[PDB]
Design a protein around this nucleic acid. Structure first.
Ligand SMILES: [Mg+2]
Ligand SMILES: [Zn+2]
Ligand SMILES: [Zn+2]
Ligand SMILES: [Zn+2]
Lengths: 49, 102, 141, 559, 160, 133, 264, 86, 196, 114, 65, 43
RNA sequence: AUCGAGAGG
């Protein structure tokens, strides 16, 4: 019934937790706040596979 | 003696309005025996109700506002804990300033 | 053979999914009043159908019986308590020498089972007993 | 902040709690293992040496015993294993670290420590299992529950320190709280649900149950009360037997709705000279209400008579309920077939009222009212239409519930339940809401990818037509799960915010003490109030009472 | 606002009046405007009321906002507890805050001030300014382990 | 020590209310068309029905522990077939020369209105009810 | 037949008797089912000494299972409580010693039943200590299971006790007990949707009592005197001897109060 | 500053004894009782050092006096014989 | 706990004779309070007692799957086919007196779980014991025979009571009280104290 | 780790008398009897028989805590009737019904053929 | 991990019934509810003792040591 | 053990709320409470 | 001891 998917380090079973992040190489527009000198921002975070 | 007269002033309005002469005799037909007893319970129950010196009340006051706030949860004004955090912080840029004019 | 597709969250913005495959059935009264109220879909430009709507849940909330009749934080509260329940975590518990292990003497498969339990092997490795429960008021304990 | 303003302490204990109906209010059920561990230094005197010498002889491994012995030289004699732990001969001026015993004063604690009424003193009652036991009617100031909570126990080590718990921090002294100027403790749970069933006009008690019910009151005059029925059979009223627990000299007048002195529905309450006259006892009478029976007896008789009053109501009502019984089950969530028809057609005509308004805004026939947009007037008129329809279904459900419906009986007693719990379980759970609005358009112009774009219908924006008895549809599940998550985050976020608020409050006002000239000052001596509360009163023994001179016509004032 | 007001008979009656509620605040120009009652005007922004209408009017406006967030939830607190808090925010010159820049910058000794926030930074300037502590604070005696002048220690005990 | 009231009444309306073994009663004094009563009555014991006409008595005797009847040595005060014990709590002056009595028999209630018991009933704890067929 | 309580037996078997108890008050027939559960004594295992155990179970797991086995105890009155006898730990006047040893010789799975328990101590001619077997295949209760190469060897002491101390010493299973099937004394308030009569089911004992006439009012002073019981036994004590010892232990228990009054 | 006493005729503090000076009076007495001190009341079968002082107080035999302080530093001494209890 | 967020510890253990019972002699393994039902709105717990009851009698499995056409009305028909009352109620008798319970009790099998929190792995008491090295305060944890913490939230609770003399003893005589010699000129603990 | 041994439910120990008898205060012919190592099987059977004695005024029992197997029994009697004789007659009156019940069942079981 | 001796609730033994129940299912080709009725188990407290039981003992025997 | 193997962490404008996109990819109910509620999600 | 992770109300 053991499903696997885990490691063994020094006899202790260990799991890698999935890590959630925002994707790179996407294009998003943000309304800046009311006391901001600029009105808007288009952003991209450029990543490389 | 002025501060003493100021402090009991609301209570005496309750006293005279209920220990009034038509009221004592027609509404609840007291005898002289019962009336003199009521004058002695009231003087005791009041003098027992006086606060005791040494009572730390600011901690009592702070806890007495603190606990009902922990049970607070939810017509478009800042209510509850953000308003309560607005009030206590002397927040200048409060989220819903309003003006009730008459 | 092109009978099933993999859809992520982005591609699912351009599709229309049914629920039961009975929604794809053409229909043109006498109903069970005790049965719940499903609206007729009134939309028919379907591209996909859900496999089963009960597959939106994880492995812990799939243990829960009748979670559609439950206020939804209770399903959350239960889903963290099923990881505290005691049972047979592995059939080789006697061989393994873990730091802590708790095993039920006489585990029982539940009398009320999710249909997703069979893929979770709960009826093969259960973690509770079917206790005879009386909801009663009796001495006040 | 962590080693001076608060630190870890000796003579402390903590374990899981549960409740005991056969415990008094000021008592705490201390386990024997905790009692054998906790000591109190007792100096030997002629009044105590005959008990203490037997205690030392009884040894640390059973109760009651001692653990150490301190001579005038000041060297501890360990009784766990010494040569002379059996032949000791006590000298005056010596200390015996004896066990915590019955009716010792201990401080009982529950965390978080918001109230003064969360760190109250108790009487020790050494009991033989693993849990901490306490009375049922002390949960509310502690905010305790027997779901897995632990509570801390605290032992004093000086004679005036023991006097400090019993004469200030004791449970009966804290029955009326300065916060809210009202009692914090009242009859709860099965005592409350049974005291309504017992006090019905139709509830009559036979002689055999009566005699057991009289002896169950711990203080008792031995006077069998005269039965309220004589000739066909000597029956008793449930009001007649309950009034034995109410001490004589108590008056309680209260009127609700149509409180004729005929009282056709047995509303209100009239208690005269420790005897009840008319009225079903429920939460208003015997709860923690202002002007309640607990508020009376704590003033009229005293604290110790009110603390003893809790058990005598508990021991009688629990016994009557033990032999009567109570339950719930699904059957008290089922309403009538015709009532289900009236609910499922009520929601349908609410589905028509939203469609017709939506088509009205679709054709731009809108009276642009001032201050809000065209969309904002649409959203308010659909949210309000759907909250009206959920309530109209629940009020349609509460009416169909008969007098024997157990959820209704818990609502009537005030033990557990509210209107909305009847409505969501049996009528319609209602309309879900994230961030205050309706269900948002998380997908592009839709809520779920099973709906067409631009669909502002009730079922597309989180309205749950079905009930918990009926069963939510899978879209209705996810919108409900969306709504409940906000409440889980709100519970999780408000808790850390409110703890920082209360700490800033206490750390600002911590030296505020009524001085001996009654002027509220601080550590520096600066005046804050000249009279505390501007009248110089303690907040307990202050009750609301109408000023009769204000209000009313000038004509009726004069007459 | 269906306000209750005395009838000419003397009894109280409900008198519905039209009331304007705004979405912004400037006190000093709105209250000097014809058509309104400038004796009844009310701002939820109590800090503005402090500088238009005196500090004593800010205190009673501060209490009315605190009382409303409790009464919004349905709870009750006695007057003396809120008004105690409301007085301490007010009993100085202006509005003194319950945050680290507010009461903890007062003249309240030193060691009590270091028990709340900016623990080490307060004790630094206290040694540089050569502060002297009265040691009448609760927190100073809690730290020192002495019996603080609380209710039991307010007085002294003496032989006859 | 003796009888304190005697009359015969005819019933008008019997009302169960929310209860299942008690009924509120509404009846007028027969051969005395100016006095009426209102009383709460156990109906599983004495099933008072509509169009009945029944006698009513109030005694003052015939504190101390209620001992059960040992035998016939303990003799009744009643050829009657329904008896309660109660307590006066108020006396309402309806008008000048018109009075009302208020009785609770452990929550079972009674209101009695007329003006010839002015010499009889009093603000005393003691009260008995007696009703004959 | 005799003055007082009267019994008419409806049905009987080796395994259960169905009977009617009549002209008895209520608290008696209650106090009879209470002693029939847990104050008449039996013999069961109360100490297990283990030698080897290569099985997949734990020793306390099988030791708990061993005590739950029904052993014969018809002649238990000749056997004395071990705390009352003067032996050092256990003798033949106060105890019974069983033994159990098995080996997985077969490649097939080898079971262990309660017939494999072998008595060792001197029985001294009383019907005592035989494991109860009502299984129609001769085997007993299935205690353990063995693999090829696994063995388990232990000795068990069986003592005297009551189910008040542990439920293994329980000679009975379930005491069916219903009085007044028609609800004529109004001892309970039925819960209903429309008709309490159509909702709730007619009990089987409704046949043995008269149907009430709706015109006649509530009998206000009748009490309950006629109770319907079905006592089921495990097999350690035969069914007739459950109630008879239940009667007798109730008799024996009152007399201890009576002789304690004499000592006062 | 230099002897900040108060004459007994001019005393505005409460004639009644506060609970906070009762519990210290009852406590300090039960302390010195527990370390073996004489007792000024016929103890009708009572051994508890607190219960002695509670019965010692209803007969007003405790020879102690509360030095009630004022915020300027002045004080008013009140003997337990003067102080009322309720 | 059950499978529906309903937690709860054990208040008391009752033997089977003290326990209430049905007319077939069936005894509850477990007794829970009805007051923990309406505020929590765990209706599926209540439907579990129905479907499991029919499951044990019929010898079938209970299809408690979500999003099915399984109704409380459809379950209850099957229960009345088995001679029990459709809403799960059963007449119960008191175990003490033997008198019938006036209320009929919702009775059935229900899946219940055993959680890792057991009292005997939680009981902790401490008179005197080991101290920490630097702070000279009691150590942390039952597993090291430690002390409970009298936090500032709990000190805040002691000022409201005015228990001034308890609060000193529990801040000093009950942990890390200590004595140092100081000088009258330099007001610091820089004096040297040769004691004997 | 704290549960008392299960034999304490029915084994007297350390000089615990089976019966303790104490006179009732503010009462006449009234006495209370702390029974020991006993439960509802014996207490509800004595009290139900005391009510059948016409010269018995009051009879009631209670368990002050279900942790412990003990109960208290209070009897009030007619004057000139020692309450111990009311208990003694009723204790003896129980056994007559039981002995007749045992004889009646045995007659019926011997008549039964299975 | 194996058949309990008796039902928890009532105390009627059930351990003698396990091997027979499986032959009523397998060999006699019977459904479950009639199998539990053939074994003399008529109370549902008894009846859930055998129906809901998972015989994990057969998986423990597969490990060789 | 199955639940521990399919669990995501979200280290840190409304991240905790059950978003509409989570349908069929993330369990709506199963998530921890209090400290980091909603950030920890189960597949 | 420190630093972590998980967990309970
Ligand atoms: Mg909890
Ligand atoms: Zn022997
Ligand atoms: Zn120096
Ligand atoms: Zn069973």
């Amino acid at each position: 019934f053991d499903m696997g998917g885990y490691f063994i380090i020094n006899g202790s079973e260990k799991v890698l937790i999935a890590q959630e992040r925002s994707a790179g190489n996407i294009v998003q527009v943000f309304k800046k706040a009311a006391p901001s000198p600029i009105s808007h921002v288009a952003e991209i975070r450029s990543a490389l596979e | 003696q002025n501060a003493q007269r100021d402090a009991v002033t609301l209570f005496c309005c309750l006293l005279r309005s209920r220990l009034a002469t038509r009221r004592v005799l027609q509404e609840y037909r007291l005898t002289k025996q019962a009336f003199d007893w009521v004058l002695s319970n009231i003087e005791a129950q009041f003098l027992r109700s006086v606060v005791h010196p040494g009572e730390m009340v600011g901690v009592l006051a702070a806890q007495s506002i603190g606990e009902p706030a922990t049970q607070m949860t939810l017509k478009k004004v800042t209510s509850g804990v953000p308003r309560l955090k607005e009030i206590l912080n002397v927040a200048k840029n409060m989220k819903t300033p309003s003006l009730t004019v008459y | 053979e092109g009978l099933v597709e993999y859809i992520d969250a982005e591609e699912e913005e351009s599709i229309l999914i049914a629920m039961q495959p009975e929604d794809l059935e053409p229909a043109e009264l006498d109903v069970d009043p005790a049965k719940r109220i499903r609206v007729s879909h009134h939309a028919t430009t379907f591209t996909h159908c859900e496999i089963h709507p009960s597959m939106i849940l994880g492995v812990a909330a799939s243990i829960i019986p009748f979670p559609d009749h439950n206020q939804s934080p209770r399903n959350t509260y239960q889903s963290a308590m099923g990881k505290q329940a005691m049972g047979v975590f592995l059939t080789n518990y006697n061989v393994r020498m873990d730091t802590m292990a708790n095993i039920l003497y006489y585990p029982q498969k539940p009398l009320g089972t999710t249909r997703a339990m069979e893929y979770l092997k709960f009826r093969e490795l259960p973690a509770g007993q079917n206790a005879i429960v009386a909801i009663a008021c009796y001495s006040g304990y | 902040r962590g080693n001076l303003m608060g630190k870890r302490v000796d003579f402390s204990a903590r374990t899981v709690i549960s409740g005991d109906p056969n415990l008094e209010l000021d008592q705490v059920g201390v386990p024997k293992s905790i009692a054998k561990t906790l000591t109190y230094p007792e100096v030997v005197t002629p009044y105590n040496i005959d008990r203490l010498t037997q205690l030392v002889r009884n040894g640390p491994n059973e109760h009651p015993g001692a653990k150490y012995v301190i001579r005038d030289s000041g060297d501890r004699i360990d009784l766990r294993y010494s040569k002379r732990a059996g032949d000791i001969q006590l000298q005056y001026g010596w200390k015996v670290e004896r066990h915590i015993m019955d009716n010792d004063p201990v401080l009982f604690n529950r965390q978080p420590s918001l109230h003064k009424m969360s760190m109250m003193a108790h009487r020790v009652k050494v009991i033989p299992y693993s849990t901490f036991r306490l009375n049922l009617s002390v949960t509310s100031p502690y905010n305790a529950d027997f779901d897995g909570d632990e509570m801390n126990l605290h032992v004093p080590q000086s004679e005036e320190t023991r006097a400090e718990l019993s004469q200030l921090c004791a449970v009966p002294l804290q029955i009326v709280s300065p916060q809210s100027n009202k009692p914090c403790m009242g009859i709860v749970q099965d005592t409350l649900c049974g005291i309504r069933k017992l006090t019905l006009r139709d509830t009559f008690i036979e002689l055999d149950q009566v005699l057991n019910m009289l002896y169950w009151v711990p203080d008792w005059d031995g006077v069998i009360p005269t039965p309220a029925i004589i000739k066909p059979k000597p029956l008793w009223s449930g009001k007649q037997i309950l009034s034995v627990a109410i001490p004589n000299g108590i008056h309680l007048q209260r009127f609700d709705e149509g409180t004729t002195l005929l009282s056709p529905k047995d509303n209100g309450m009239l208690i005269i000279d420790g005897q009840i006259i008319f009225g079903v006892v429920e939460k208003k009478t015997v709860g923690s209400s202002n002007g309640g029976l607990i508020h009376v007896v704590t003033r009229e008789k005293g604290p110790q008579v009110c603390a003893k009053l809790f058990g005598n109501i508990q021991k009688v009502v629990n016994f009557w309920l033990l032999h009567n019984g109570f339950s719930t089950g699904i059957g008290d969530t089922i309403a009538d077939g015709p009532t289900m028809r009236e609910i499922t057609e009520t929601i349908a005509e609410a589905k028509k009222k939203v469609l017709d308004v939506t088509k009205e805004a679709q054709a731009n026939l809108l009276t642009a009212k001032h201050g809000m947009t065209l969309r904002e007037s649409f959203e308010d008129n659909v949210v309000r239409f759907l909250n009206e329809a959920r309530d109209k279904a629940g009020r349609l459900a509460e009416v169909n519930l008969k007098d024997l419906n157990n959820v209704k009986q818990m609502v009537m007693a005030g033990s557990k339940g509210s209107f909305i719990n009847i409505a969501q379980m049996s009528a319609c759970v209602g309309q879900q809401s994230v961030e205050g609005k309706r269900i948002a358009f998380g997908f592009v112009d839709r809520t779920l990818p099973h709906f067409s774009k631009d669909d502002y219908s009730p079922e597309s924006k989180g309205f749950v037509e079905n009930s918990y008895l009926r069963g939510l549809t899978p879209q209705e599940f996810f919108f409900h799960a969306m709504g409940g998550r906000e409440g889980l985050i709100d519970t999780a976020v408000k808790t850390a915010e409110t703890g920082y608020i209360q700490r800033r409050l206490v750390k600002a006002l911590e030296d505020i003490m009524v001085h001996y000239d009654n002027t509220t000052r601080n550590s520096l001596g600066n005046v804050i109030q000249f009279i505390y509360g501007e009248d110089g009163m303690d907040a307990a023994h202050i009750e609301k009472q109408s000023l009769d001179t204000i209000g009313g016509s000038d004509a009726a004032f004069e007459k | 606002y269906d306000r209750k007001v005395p009838s000419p008979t003397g009894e109280y009656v409900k008198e519905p009046e039209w009331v304007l509620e705004t979405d912004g605040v400037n006190l000093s120009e709105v209250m000097t405007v014809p058509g309104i009652d400038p004796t009844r005007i009310y701002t939820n922004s109590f800090i503005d009321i402090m500088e238009v209408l005196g500090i004593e009017a800010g205190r009673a406006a501060l209490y009315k906002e605190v009382y409303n967030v409790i009464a919004s939830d349905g709870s009750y607190v006695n007057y003396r507890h809120m008004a105690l808090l409301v007085d301490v925010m007010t009993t100085q010159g202006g509005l003194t805050s319950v945050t680290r820049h507010g009461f903890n910058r007062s003249n309240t000794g030193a060691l009590m001030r270091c028990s709340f926030e900016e623990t080490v930074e307060i004790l630094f300037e206290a040694g540089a300014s050569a502060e002297l502590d009265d040691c009448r604070g609760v927190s100073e005696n809690v730290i020192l382990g002495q019996m603080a002048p609380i209710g039991t220690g307010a007085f002294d005990v003496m032989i006859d | 020590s003796n009888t304190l009231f005697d009359d015969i009444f005819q019933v008008s309306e019997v009302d169960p209310g929310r209860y299942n073994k008690v009924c509120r009663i509404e009846a007028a004094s027969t051969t005395q068309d100016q006095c009426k009563l209102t009383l709460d009555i156990n109906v599983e014991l004495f099933p008072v029905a509509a169009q009945d006409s029944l006698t009513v008595t109030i005694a003052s005797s015939l504190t101390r522990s209620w001992r059960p009847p040992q035998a016939g040595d303990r003799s009744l005060a009643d050829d009657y077939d329904y008896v309660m014990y109660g307590t006066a709590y108020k006396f309402e002056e309806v008008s000048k020369d018109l009075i009302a009595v208020y009785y609770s028999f452990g929550g079972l209630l009674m209101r009695l209105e007329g003006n010839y018991r002015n010499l009889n009933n009093l603000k005393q704890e003691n009260a008995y009810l007696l009703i004959r067929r | 037949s005799e003055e007082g309580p009267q019994v008419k037996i409806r049905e009987a078997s080796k395994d259960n008797v169905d009977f009617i108890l009549s002209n008895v008050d209520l608290a008696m027939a209650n106090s009879l089912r209470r002693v029939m559960i847990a104050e008449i004594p039996t013999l069961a295992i109360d100490s297990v000494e283990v030698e080897t155990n290569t099985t997949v179970l734990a020793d306390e797991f099988i030791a708990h299972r061993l005590g739950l086995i029904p052993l014969q105890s018809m002649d238990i009155e000749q056997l004395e409580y071990s705390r009352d006898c003067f032996c050092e730990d256990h003798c033949d006047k106060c105890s019974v010693v069983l033994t159990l040893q098995a080996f997985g010789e077969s490649e097939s799975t080898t079971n262990v039943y309660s017939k494999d328990l072998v008595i060792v101590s001197n029985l001294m001619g009383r019907n005592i200590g035989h494991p109860i077997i009502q299984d129609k295949e001769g085997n007993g209760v299935l205690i353990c299971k063995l693999r090829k190469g696994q063995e388990l060897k232990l000795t068990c002491v069986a003592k005297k006790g009551i189910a008040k101390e542990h439920a293994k010493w329980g000679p009975a299973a379930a005491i069916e007990f219903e009085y007044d099937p028609w609800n004529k004394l109004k001892h309970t308030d039925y819960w209903y949707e429309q008709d309490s009569a159509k909702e709730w089911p007619q009990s089987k004992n409704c046949e043995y009592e008269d149907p009430p006439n709706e015109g006649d009012p509530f009998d206000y002073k009748a009490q309950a005197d006629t109770f319907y019981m079905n006592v089921e036994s495990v097999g350690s004590i035969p069914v007739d001897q459950v109630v008879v010892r239940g009667i007798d232990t109730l008799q024996k228990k009152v007399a201890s109060i009576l002789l304690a009054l004499t000592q006062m | 500053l230099k002897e900040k006493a108060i004459p007994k005729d001019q005393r505005a503090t409460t004639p009644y004894m506060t609970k906070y000076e009762r519990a210290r009076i009852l406590g300090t007495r039960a302390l010195q009782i527990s370390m073996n001190a004489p007792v000024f009341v016929d103890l009708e079968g009572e051994t508890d050092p607190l219960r002695i002082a509670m019965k010692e107080l209803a007969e007003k035999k405790i020879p102690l006096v509360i030095r009630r302080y004022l915020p300027d530093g002045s004080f008013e001494d009140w003997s337990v014989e003067e102080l009322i209890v309720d | 706990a059950s499978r529906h967020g309903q937690k709860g510890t054990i208040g008391i253990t009752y033997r089977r004779e003290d326990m209430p019972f049905t007319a077939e002699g069936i005894v509850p393994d477990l007794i829970i309070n009805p007051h923990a039902i309406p505020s929590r709105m765990t209706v599926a717990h209540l439907i579990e007692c129905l479907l499991s009851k029919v499951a044990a009698l019929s010898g079938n499995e209970g299809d408690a799957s979500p999003f099915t056409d399984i109704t409380v009305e459809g379950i209850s028909k099957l229960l009345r086919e088995h001679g029990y009352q459709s809403r799960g109620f059963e007449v119960m008798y008191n175990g003490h007196t033997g008198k019938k319970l006036m209320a009929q009790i919702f009775f059935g099998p229900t899946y219940y779980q055993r959680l890792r929190h057991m009292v005997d792995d939680k009981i902790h008491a401490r008179a005197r014991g080991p101290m920490q090295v630097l702070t000279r305060q009691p150590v942390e944890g039952r597993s090291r025979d430690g002390g409970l913490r009298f936090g500032e939230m709990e000190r805040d609770c002691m000022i409201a009571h005015g228990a001034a003399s308890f609060l000193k003893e529990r801040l000093m005589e009950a942990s890390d009280a200590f004595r140092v010699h100081i000088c009258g000129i330099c007001g610091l603990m820089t004096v040297i104290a040769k004691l004997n | 780790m704290n549960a008392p041994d299960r034999f304490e439910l029915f084994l007297l120990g350390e000089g615990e008398s089976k019966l303790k008898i104490d006179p009732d205060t503010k009462a006449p012919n009234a006495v209370v009897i702390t029974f020991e190592k006993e439960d509802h099987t014996l207490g509800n059977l004595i009290r139900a028989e005391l009510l059948n004695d016409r010269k018995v005024l009051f009879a009631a029992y209670k368990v002050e805590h279900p942790f412990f197997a003990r109960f208290k029994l209070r009897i009030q009697t007619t004057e000139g009737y020692d309450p111990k004789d009311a208990l003694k007659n009723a204790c003896n009156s129980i056994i007559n019904k039981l002995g007749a019940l045992k004889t009646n069942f045995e007659t019926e079981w011997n008549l039964q053929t299975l | 991990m194996i058949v309990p001796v008796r039902c928890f609730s009532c105390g009627k033994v059930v351990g003698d019934k396990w091997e027979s129940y499986l032959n009523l299912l397998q060999e006699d080709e019977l459904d479950e509810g009639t199998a539990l009725s053939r074994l003399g188990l008529k109370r549902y407290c008894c009846r859930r003792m055998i129906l809901t039981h998972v015989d994990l003992i057969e998986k423990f025997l597969r490990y060789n040591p | 053990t199955l639940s521990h193997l399919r669990r995501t962490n979200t280290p840190i404008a409304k991240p905790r709320q059950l978003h509409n996109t989570h349908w069929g990819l993330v369990c709506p109910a199963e998530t921890p409470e209090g400290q980091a509620c909603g950030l920890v999600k189960n597949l």
